[PDB]
Structure 1
Amino acid sequence: PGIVELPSLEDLKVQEVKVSSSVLKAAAHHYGAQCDKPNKEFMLCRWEEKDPRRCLE
């Protein structure tokens, strides 16, 4: 029936936070305090769009 429209692999090529679970957990409270605005923006647009192909920026 329909066709899928997948994003290119170049757009997904982005450097990562290459850390562990314990490092993320140790600074979890301060990351959630300082960096609330972009995280909340991403969570809201993911909740209201429901499409990861449009939720990359």
Structure 2
Amino acid sequence: PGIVELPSLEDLKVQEVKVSSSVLKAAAHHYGAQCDKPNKEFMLCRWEEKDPRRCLE
């Protein structure tokens, strides 16, 4: 059929949250309070686009 279209490795570069799972879980409730709006924009984009390639930004 058709070629599956994948983003470049420069479309996938972002600075990573290089902390552990306990470090994430310790600040978890404050992260949900303070970082609410881009997280919810992303998860709405993720359940609506149904595609990780349309949600990269």
Q: Which residue number in structure 2 is paired with residue 26 of structure 1?
A: 26
SS class of match (1:41): helix
Unmatched tracts of structure 1, length 5 or more? none
Distance 1:30 1:8 in 2: 34
> Aligned residues, how many?
57
Runs of 4+ in 1 over 6 A off after TM superposition: none
Root mean square deviation of aligned Cα = 0.6
Distance 1:13 1:30 in 2: 26
Shift of 1:54: 1.0
More helix by share: 1
Q: Percent identity?
A: 100
